[PDB]
Design a protein around this ligand. Structure first.
Ligand SMILES: CC1(C)C=C(CSSP(=O)(O)OP(=O)(O)OC[C@H]2O[C@@H](n3cnc4c(N)ncnc43)[C@H](O)[C@@H]2O)C(C)(C)N1O
Length: 183
């Protein structure tokens, strides 16, 4: 069991982010931090596709268009950060964007409609719990893209390796997703 820098995976994404950024007419700023931290050849190879998902949404859905984005006083060029820091005995990766932000009450209104939870205990769940509703399958008939990137696939890889994904978000201030990994 042999460890190689997290550079191996991270370095692939910039080309993609640029690619994906250009498809939806959005200019983005991509920052990668902590490339030197190291994980086992296994742990690195798995997370790429999971990480790739989290990046895409930020460009795709996280970062606003210039005209609407320029209005709020935030700089016109959105910023996307992928970082890995070696803290303690756990390896944590984070992806953050200065984006629209996930509207937490939209997730709460979806859990009630679909019966995941009833409304009167909505007060029970914590903000941290609300976004976990992004992890139920099919939270997202006539038409079906035979090809589908789901959020859970990520939750799984993380859960696969004894690891915990998390989502923190603040409407119109941005969202950040975090992946803690052991050893
Ligand atoms: C109606 C909608 C959106 C659904 C589609 C199919 S949906 S399949 P999908 O894989 O896209 O669904 P996701 O499992 O990706 O969840 C995406 C859900 O989470 C939140 N969200 C996740 N990351 C976020 C981020 N960085 N910034 C802000 N919001 C984020 C989003 O507001 C969204 O509501 C298509 C593309 C046709 N379409 O126009």
């Amino acid at each position: 069991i042999r460890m190689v820098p997290i550079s191996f995976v991270f370095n692939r994404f910039p080309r993609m982010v640029r690619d994906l950024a250009k498809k939806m007419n959005k200019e983005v700023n991509f920052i990668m931090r902590g490339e030197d931290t190291e994980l086992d050849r296994t742990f690195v190879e798995e997370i790429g596709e999971p990480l790739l998902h989290l990046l895409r949404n930020a460009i795709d859905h996280g970062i606003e268009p210039k005209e609407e984005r320029i209005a709020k006083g935030k700089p016109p060029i959105g910023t996307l950060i992928l970082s890995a820091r070696h803290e303690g005995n756990n390896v944590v990766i984070e992806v953050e964007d200065d984006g629209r932000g996930i509207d937490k009450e939209k997730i709460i209104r979806k859990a009630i409609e679909k019966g995941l939870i009833d409304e009167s205990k909505a007060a029970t769940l914590s903000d941290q719990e609300i976004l976990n509703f992004l992890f139920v399958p099919g939270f997202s008939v006539s038409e079906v893209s035979g090809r589908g990137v789901g959020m859970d696939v990520v939750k799984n890889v993380v859960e696969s390796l004894n690891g915990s994904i998390s989502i923190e978000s603040e409407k119109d201030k941005g969202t950040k997703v975090t992946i803690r990994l052991p050893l």
